[PDB]
């Protein structure tokens, strides 16, 4: 499948993945292509925090969906 990211400071990037991939894997892919370490990232889907060892499936994420991102330290 492919899905997207569109929140940072004037950039889009894209994500090519399967429906049972974990969010800890998705984070690794964002560190692989925007450099941000996996503990700093928090990803959000429709006013919702994406928990690290859950999946696309567990949030019901699908083809062409758009995530956004906030950065911290504690938490996942």
CA dihedral (6, 10, 14, 20) positive or negative:
negative
Place of tokens 């429709």: 46
Of residues 29 and 42, the one with the C-beta less far from other proteins: 42
20 binds other proteins (CB under 8 A): no
Site residues (CB under 8 A) for other proteins, limited to 46-65: 46-49
Q: What is each CA distance from 71 to 26, 58, 60, 74, in whole angstroms? A: 15, 22, 23, 10
Min CB(2)–other proteins separation in Å: 19
Binding-site ranges for other proteins (CB under 8 A): 6-9, 42, 44, 46-49, 66, 68, 70, 74
């Amino acid at each position: 499948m492919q899905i997207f990211v569109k929140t940072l400071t004037g950039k889009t990037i894209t994500l090519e993945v399967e429906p049972s991939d974990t969010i800890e894997n998705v984070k690794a892919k964002i560190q692989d292509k925007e450099g941000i370490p996996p503990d700093q990232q928090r990803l959000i889907f429709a006013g919702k925090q994406l928990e690290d060892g859950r999946t696309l499936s567990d949030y019901n994420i699908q083809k062409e969906s758009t995530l956004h991102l906030v950065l911290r330290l504690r938490g996942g």
